[PDB]
Motif scaffolding. Structure first.
Motif, PDB file in Angstrom:
ATOM      1  N   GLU E  58      17.369 -36.585  43.750  1.00 22.64           N
ATOM      2  CA  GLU E  58      16.228 -36.482  43.927  1.00 22.64           C
ATOM      3  C   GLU E  58      14.798 -36.325  43.502  1.00 22.64           C
ATOM      4  O   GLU E  58      14.194 -37.625  43.506  1.00 22.64           O
ATOM      5  N   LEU E  59      15.509 -35.459  42.006  1.00 16.66           N
ATOM      6  CA  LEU E  59      14.298 -34.580  41.892  1.00 16.66           C
ATOM      7  C   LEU E  59      13.759 -35.760  40.991  1.00 16.66           C
ATOM      8  O   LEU E  59      11.962 -36.880  40.700  1.00 16.66           O
ATOM      9  N   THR E  60      14.958 -36.196  40.209  1.00 16.32           N
ATOM     10  CA  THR E  60      14.660 -37.482  38.690  1.00 16.32           C
ATOM     11  C   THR E  60      13.841 -38.920  39.685  1.00 16.32           C
ATOM     12  O   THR E  60      13.404 -39.495  39.227  1.00 16.32           O
ATOM     13  N   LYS E  61      14.180 -39.039  40.482  1.00 18.80           N
ATOM     14  CA  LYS E  61      14.057 -40.715  41.411  1.00 18.80           C
ATOM     15  C   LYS E  61      12.564 -40.025  41.957  1.00 18.80           C
ATOM     16  O   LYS E  61      11.717 -41.261  41.443  1.00 18.80           O
ATOM     17  N   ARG E  62      11.763 -39.267  42.636  1.00 20.10           N
ATOM     18  CA  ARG E  62      11.070 -38.896  42.682  1.00 20.10           C
ATOM     19  C   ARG E  62      10.004 -39.137  41.704  1.00 20.10           C
ATOM     20  O   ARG E  62       8.618 -39.704  41.290  1.00 20.10           O
ATOM     21  N   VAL E  63      10.358 -38.887  40.541  1.00 14.87           N
ATOM     22  CA  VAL E  63       9.675 -38.708  38.947  1.00 14.87           C
ATOM     23  C   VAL E  63       9.481 -39.649  38.191  1.00 14.87           C
ATOM     24  O   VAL E  63       9.380 -39.832  37.441  1.00 14.87           O
ATOM     25  N   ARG E  64      10.796 -40.695  38.505  1.00 15.21           N
ATOM     26  CA  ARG E  64      11.386 -41.657  37.802  1.00 15.21           C
ATOM     27  C   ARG E  64       9.895 -42.388  37.411  1.00 15.21           C
ATOM     28  O   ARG E  64       9.331 -42.528  38.951  1.00 15.21           O
ATOM     29  N   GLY E  65       9.409 -43.406  36.447  1.00 15.90           N
ATOM     30  CA  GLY E  65       8.367 -44.491  37.159  1.00 15.90           C
ATOM     31  C   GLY E  65       6.974 -43.944  36.766  1.00 15.90           C
ATOM     32  O   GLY E  65       6.571 -44.506  37.184  1.00 15.90           O
ATOM     33  N   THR E  66       7.114 -43.072  36.367  1.00 16.70           N
ATOM     34  CA  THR E  66       5.695 -42.511  36.839  1.00 16.70           C
ATOM     35  C   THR E  66       5.208 -42.016  34.667  1.00 16.70           C
ATOM     36  O   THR E  66       6.271 -40.820  33.803  1.00 16.70           O
ATOM     37  N   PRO E  67       4.518 -41.413  34.821  1.00 22.05           N
ATOM     38  CA  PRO E  67       3.280 -40.436  33.212  1.00 22.05           C
ATOM     39  C   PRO E  67       4.429 -39.661  33.047  1.00 22.05           C
ATOM     40  O   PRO E  67       4.054 -39.066  31.945  1.00 22.05           O
ATOM     41  N   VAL E  68       4.888 -39.069  34.363  1.00 25.80           N
ATOM     42  CA  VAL E  68       4.807 -37.508  33.774  1.00 25.80           C
ATOM     43  C   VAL E  68       6.594 -37.334  33.589  1.00 25.80           C
ATOM     44  O   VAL E  68       7.252 -36.341  33.381  1.00 25.80           O
ATOM     45  N   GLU E  69       7.329 -38.558  33.881  1.00 23.13           N
ATOM     46  CA  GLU E  69       9.115 -38.491  33.573  1.00 23.13           C
ATOM     47  C   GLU E  69       9.296 -38.002  31.905  1.00 23.13           C
ATOM     48  O   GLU E  69      10.354 -37.041  32.446  1.00 23.13           O
ATOM     49  N   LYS E  70       8.871 -37.901  31.040  1.00 24.85           N
ATOM     50  CA  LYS E  70       9.519 -37.464  29.873  1.00 24.85           C
ATOM     51  C   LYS E  70       9.087 -36.302  29.492  1.00 24.85           C
ATOM     52  O   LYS E  70       9.645 -36.045  29.326  1.00 24.85           O
ATOM     53  N   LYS E  71       8.413 -35.234  30.078  1.00 26.11           N
ATOM     54  CA  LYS E  71       7.475 -34.244  30.395  1.00 26.11           C
ATOM     55  C   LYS E  71       8.625 -33.606  30.744  1.00 26.11           C
ATOM     56  O   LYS E  71       9.366 -32.338  30.759  1.00 26.11           O
ATOM     57  N   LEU E  72       9.641 -33.736  32.024  1.00 32.48           N
ATOM     58  CA  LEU E  72      10.790 -32.604  33.757  1.00 32.48           C
ATOM     59  C   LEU E  72      11.871 -32.658  32.052  1.00 32.48           C
ATOM     60  O   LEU E  72      12.465 -34.103  31.917  1.00 32.48           O
ATOM     61  N   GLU E  73      12.876 -31.742  32.219  1.00 33.60           N
ATOM     62  CA  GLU E  73      13.566 -31.317  31.859  1.00 33.60           C
ATOM     63  C   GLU E  73      14.553 -30.603  33.099  1.00 33.60           C
ATOM     64  O   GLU E  73      14.041 -30.213  33.858  1.00 33.60           O
ATOM     65  N   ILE E  74      16.036 -30.860  33.534  1.00 35.18           N
ATOM     66  CA  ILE E  74      16.231 -30.168  34.258  1.00 35.18           C
ATOM     67  C   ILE E  74      17.818 -30.224  33.641  1.00 35.18           C
ATOM     68  O   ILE E  74      18.929 -30.411  33.350  1.00 35.18           O
ATOM     69  N   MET E  75      18.477 -28.838  33.714  1.00 38.17           N
ATOM     70  CA  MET E  75      19.323 -28.056  34.009  1.00 38.17           C
ATOM     71  C   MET E  75      20.084 -28.033  34.502  1.00 38.17           C
ATOM     72  O   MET E  75      19.377 -27.603  35.916  1.00 38.17           O
ATOM     73  N   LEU E  76      21.298 -28.033  34.880  1.00 40.18           N
ATOM     74  CA  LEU E  76      22.292 -28.176  35.962  1.00 40.18           C
ATOM     75  C   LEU E  76      22.972 -26.534  35.664  1.00 40.18           C
ATOM     76  O   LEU E  76      23.841 -26.695  34.800  1.00 40.18           O
TER      77      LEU E  76
END
Ligand SMILES: [Mg+2]
Ligand SMILES: [Mg+2]
Ligand SMILES: [Mg+2]
Ligand SMILES: [Mg+2]
Ligand SMILES: [Mg+2]
Ligand SMILES: [Mg+2]
Lengths: 96, 179, 127, 14, 283, 56, 211, 8
Positions: E58-76
RNA sequence: UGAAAUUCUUGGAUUUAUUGAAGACUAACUACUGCGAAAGCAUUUGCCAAGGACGUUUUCAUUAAUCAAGAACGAAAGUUAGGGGAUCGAAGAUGAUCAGAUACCGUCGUAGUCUUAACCAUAAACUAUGCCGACUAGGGAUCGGGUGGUGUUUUUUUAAUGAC
RNA sequence: CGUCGCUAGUACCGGAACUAAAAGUUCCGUAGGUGAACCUGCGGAAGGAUCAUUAAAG
RNA sequence: GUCGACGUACUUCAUAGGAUCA
């Protein structure tokens, strides 16, 4: 006689509002369903209405009602029910 | 089928019900089980014996003694008769103090919570768990199948530890559906 | 012509023992427990486990020469429950059915005049 | 779930 | 699970983090991402540790198609189990169950963050912030204060969290000390453990425990062994010498009659130095 | 408060220096975590015996 | 590799002459390599009903210890007495006062022993009160009377004579007679007997007891 | 009552 | 255990019998009944002092009620210094971390629990209900004392007591 | 139906061979807490839902 | 220092009940 004494002693100690409220409600049903109470004659109702008008004991000028109202304790649901219960009972005696 | 005897002492508070129900107690013992029944008034103990010439089922004597014992603990006659009818019923017994050291009004309220108003809570456990419960003061006896008595015991114990009846009642519906 | 032993039945919460010994109690004739007759540790206290244990000792005792046993049923006792459980009740029934003569049945649970504290704590146990 | 005493005796339920 | 909905407190947390534009932020307990978006707005790049794959998606969906999208990284994964990358700042609203480990992990990171803004329950935060002589001064307080400095940011109430929890919360700031003070963690914690079994009793009474004497005697024998000195190894050989050593050090340090709850960092350091002088090593 | 804090800082620095004077490893020493146990299993006894044998 | 009962050997236990039925079963023990030492000190508890052949003693048990061995016969001697748990739980009832006394005393045989006696209050024939509680003065008086009685019978008798008194329950009737005026009572029983100390063993005093 | 006081 | 695993175990565990040692606690009888100013008090016997109620045609003759100051005691927990240390057990450690009625379980267990000499002075220390005095309905149960009966029982010689 | 794959294994000199691979309860006092959205020890309270049996010295 | 406790001054949430009619 002992058995009623033991049971009567134990029920005496329990004085929770919810417990006593449930018992009172069930009792009023049984007396109502069995019609234990005699019908009030017109003269009986008039006498009861006369005392109520003489005293006006069931309005919000009483000590308890005035104490709860003036101090925002009747905004709560439970104490409002008791106030309204008192007021409807007064209205009953006022009926003609 | 050798000559054997069993003695089951009747406590005084169960003697009078034993009198009124004696007419319905000796027929099944003497007819189906072919047992020789007797009560010794001097000792106030129910005596059962195997008749070697007539009795045929080896387990009749012990089956009968458990049936008398179940009535002795406080279980109604018909429920006790289930011990004669079946062979997979057992009696679980435990005290309130075993679960929790309750005294004074705490002990009285614990017993009241188990029984519930008008005995509703006890019947709720009995129906859901397919068992019969006798609540003798702080002494609790449960009768039923082995898997069933354990389920009833857990529901009872939760009430002793303080769980409100309402929540225990909902849990009874869930297990009842599973049954 | 009739030899007596003593059949000691220890009915705990998680297992049932059936121990047959001579009259004194020093000499053991046959000890079988619920665990030795069941595959899953859950069913060791089960009545079915006791029946198998009772039958095994009943067969073994007949081989030895013992033909009758006095039953001394007991629970864990002490600060714990005092009444024998269904595992003990089942063991008694199986012994009767085995044909082994049952002499006298008595409860010998250790009952304390007054005991130490119980393991539960102030809030209780056995949720 | 019934909250009253079961009419059927325990032998009958089983 | 409890989810914050007050925007003012989230804004305050992110602001007080003081994220420089060249900072990489470790954001534990991402949740929906109300904090994550704002941290992304003013950070070099964000590494997020999420336990629930659904919430990460859901977080990835929220940040998708935004200028900050490349910045985020998610570890599971589980935060404690994972081996984490270099991060400059920590901003966490993680479940409180891992509150205590988290802190020490941040302390023991190879390069600890310069600042961290952590939310805990009120009792835990107050115990972290407790000063010597206070009622809630405890082992946690002494240990963390030796390895860091914790200050109080704000008090977060019950109404902010839906559903309401049974405990109030607070945001605190943890600043690990750089350079790390040069004391072995094991020995510091061992001394504190021996002395904090009952913090309102005398320290001597803390050392009277028989098991404590056994542990200290075994440690003394091991210390003699490492120094190549020959030691008998019998159970009660060195009891009387260690007892005398403890008595002398406690007397000379004047800490025998001082309650642990009223002793500050320097007192415990003095006691540790005295015990090292006489030859007793704790852990 | 400031002067008291600075004096405490200087004292702490001196004590930490003297601690570096007296420093060893902690792998072999038994942790104080064992204070509550009061009894050891045969696995723990075997581990201790192996450790002591390795120490010699 | 060895079934233990191949090497076991059976022995027949014989009870004192004070009891009617001397045959009280049998036991087993490993064959001598001695069997006597293991046999000696062995204690067997048996209901009085079996020894007397009467169901009037269904609620009493006697412990007899093996003291001599002769030709597969185990000659035993009285060691203790007790009540069954069911009987005690039966007597102890609500709405009455329990009066229990104990006395330590040595017989004429230097057999030190401890006797525990129990009794309960009962309501009169015409009594209407629910309960029959006794005032503490009456309890103390009854306890004193029971103590004096038990000491008197034990001191002026031998252990065999003491058992001979125990079987017919004469002491209970004597207590009832003595306590009749103090307060009415029921279920007066010599609840238990313990044998604390023993004198020097005399095989003659055992053979005489066994005839 | 059959069996009340005698064998039945 | 919902199933397991840490744990013990062919050097014999668990269970059985005969003993012995230690430290606590007084089941069932047990009842909102009894006692104490309150907190509290339950095995037997002895000693020491104390106490309510009752009976009294005994004695003093207002000596009394309530009470700032001031004093005695004050559950549990807790602190100081010895003793003890069985059980249970805050703290600490450790196994498992799968399954929602049985969802917090298990094992080891420091301080404590007990006691002696002192500190602390808090409780839902509750009848959520100041103390003293007077008056205002009937009923029968129970505890302690006293009076009355030509009442039952026992004293199994009477009786007198005791119990009803 | 072919080629290279990916997983496991066997060997050989990153490379190059072979084999296998049916998946999709509510609290009070006190004392503590380092997997604390809260837990625990001791004493107390109800301000928490009493059914059945009951003279068996009958 | 968006620090803790206290004191002070304020804000806010818990009001409908019976009868008749459609
Ligand atoms: Mg009394
Ligand atoms: Mg007086
Ligand atoms: Mg004082
Ligand atoms: Mg001490
Ligand atoms: Mg109280
Ligand atoms: Mg008055």
């Amino acid at each position: 006689m002992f058995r009623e004494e033991r049971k009567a002693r134990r029920l005496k100690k329990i004085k929770s509002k919810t417990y006593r409220k449930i018992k009172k409600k069930e009792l009023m049903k049984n007396r109502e369903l069995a019609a234990v109470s005699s019908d009030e004659d017109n003269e009986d109702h008039d006498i009861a209405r006369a005392k109520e008008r003489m005293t006006l004991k069931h309005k919000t000028n009483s000590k308890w009602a005035k104490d709860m109202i003036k101090h925002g304790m009747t905004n709560d649901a439970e104490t409002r029910e008791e106030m309204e219960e008192m007021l409807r009972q007064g209205e009953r005696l006022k009926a003609k | 089928i050798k000559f054997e005897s069993r003695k089951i002492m009747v406590p005084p508070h169960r003697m009078t019900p034993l009198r009124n129900s004696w007419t319905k107690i000796y027929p099944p013992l003497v007819e189906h089980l072919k047992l020789q029944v007797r009560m010794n008034l001097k000792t106030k103990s129910v005596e059962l014996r195997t008749n070697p010439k007539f009795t045929t089922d080896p387990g009749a004597l012990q089956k009968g003694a458990d049936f008398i014992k179940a009535f002795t603990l406080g279980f109604d006659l018909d429920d006790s008769i289930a011990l004669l009818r079946l062979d997979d019923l057992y009696i679980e017994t435990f005290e309130v103090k075993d679960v929790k050291t309750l005294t004074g009004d705490h002990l009285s309220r614990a017993i009241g919570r188990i029984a519930g108003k008008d005995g509703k809570t006890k019947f709720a456990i009995e129906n859901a768990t397919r068992t019969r419960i006798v609540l003798a003061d702080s002494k609790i006896h449960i009768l039923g199948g082995f898997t069933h008595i354990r389920m009833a015991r857990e529901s009872v114990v939760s009430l002793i530890l303080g769980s409100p009846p309402g929540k225990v009642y909902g849990n009874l519906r869930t297990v009842a559906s599973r049954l | 012509s009739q030899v007596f032993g003593v059949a000691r039945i220890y009915a705990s919460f998680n297992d049932t023992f059936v121990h047959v010994t001579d009259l004194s109690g020093k000499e053991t004739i046959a000890r079988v427990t619920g665990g030795m007759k069941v595959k899953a540790d859950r069913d060791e206290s089960s009545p079915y486990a006791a029946m198998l244990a009772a039958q095994d000792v009943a067969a073994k005792c007949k081989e030895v020469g013992i033909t009758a046993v006095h039953v001394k049923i007991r629970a864990t006792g002490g600060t714990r429950t005092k009444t024998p459980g269904p595992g003990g009740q089942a063991a008694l029934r199986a012994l009767a059915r085995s044909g082994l003569r049952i002499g006298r049945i008595e409860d010998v649970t250790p009952v304390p005049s007054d005991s130490t504290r119980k393991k539960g704590g102030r809030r209780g146990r056995r949720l | 779930l019934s909250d009253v005493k079961s009419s059927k005796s325990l032998a009958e339920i089983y | 699970q409890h989810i914050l909905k007050n925007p003012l407190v989230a804004q305050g947390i992110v602001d007080k983090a003081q994220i420089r534009p060249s900072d990489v932020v470790l954001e534990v307990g991402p949740g929906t991402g109300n904090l994550t978006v704002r941290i992304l707005e003013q950070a070099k790049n964000v590494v997020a540790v999420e336990m629930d794959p659904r919430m990460a998606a859901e977080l990835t969906k929220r940040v998708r198609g935004t200028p900050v999208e490349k910045k985020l990284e998610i570890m599971l994964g589980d935060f404690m189990k994972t081996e984490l990358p270099y991060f400059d700042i920590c901003i966490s609203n993680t479940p409180y169950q891992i509150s205590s480990p988290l802190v020490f992990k941040l302390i023991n990171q190879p390069r600890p963050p310069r600042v961290s803004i952590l939310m805990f329950q009120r009792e835990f935060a107050l115990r972290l912030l407790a000063r010597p002589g206070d009622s809630l001064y405890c082992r946690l307080s002494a240990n963390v204060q030796m390895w860091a400095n914790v200050t109080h940011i704000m008090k977060v109430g019950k109404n902010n969290f839906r559903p309401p929890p049974q405990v109030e919360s607070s945001v605190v700031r943890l600043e690990i000390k750089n350079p790390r003070p040069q004391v072995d963690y094991n020995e510091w914690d061992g001394l504190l453990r021996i002395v904090f079994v009952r913090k309102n009793r005398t320290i001597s009474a803390g050392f009277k425990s028989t098991t404590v004497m056994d542990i200290l005697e075994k440690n003394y024998k091991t210390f003699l062994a490492m120094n190549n000195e020959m030691v008998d190894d019998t159970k009660g050989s060195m009891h009387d010498v260690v007892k005398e050593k403890i008595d002398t050090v406690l007397k000379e340090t004047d800490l025998g009659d001082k309650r642990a709850g009223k002793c500050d960092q320097n007192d415990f350091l003095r006691l540790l130095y005295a015990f090292h002088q006489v030859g007793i090593h704790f852990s | 408060k400031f002067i008291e804090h600075q004096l405490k800082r200087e004292e702490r620095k001196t004590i930490i220096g003297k601690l570096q004077d007296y420093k060893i490893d902690t792998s072999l020493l038994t942790s104080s975590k064992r204070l509550g146990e009061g009894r050891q299993t045969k696995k723990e006894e075997f581990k201790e015996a192996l450790s002591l044998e390795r120490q010699g | 590799v060895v079934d233990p009962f191949t090497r076991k050997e059976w022995f027949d236990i014989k009870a004192p002459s004070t009891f009617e039925n001397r045959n009280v079963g049998k036991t087993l023990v490993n064959k001598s390599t001695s069997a006597s030492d293991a046999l000696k000190g062995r204690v067997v508890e048996v209901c009085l009903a079996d020894l007397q052949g009467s169901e009037d003693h269904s609620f009493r048990k006697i412990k007899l210890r093996v003291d001599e061995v002769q030709g597969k016969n185990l000659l035993t001697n009285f060691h203790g007495m007790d009540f069954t748990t069911d009987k005690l739980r039966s007597m102890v009832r609500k709405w009455q006062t329990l009066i229990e006394a104990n006395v330590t005393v040595k017989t004429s045989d230097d057999y030190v022993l401890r006797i525990f006696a129990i009794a309960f209050t009962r309501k009169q024939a015409n009594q209407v009160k629910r309960h029959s509680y006794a005032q503490s003065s009456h309890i103390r008086a009854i306890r004193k009377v029971i103590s004096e009685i038990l000491t008197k019978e034990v001191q002026g008798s031998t252990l065999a004579q003491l058992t001979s008194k125990l079987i017919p329950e004469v002491i209970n009737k004597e207590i009832e007679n003595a306590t009749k005026d103090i307060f009415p009572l029921q279920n007066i029983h010599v609840r238990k007997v313990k044998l604390l100390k023993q004198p020097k063993f005399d095989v003659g005093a055992l053979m005489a007891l066994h005839g | 009552l059959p069996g009340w006081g005698e064998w039945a």
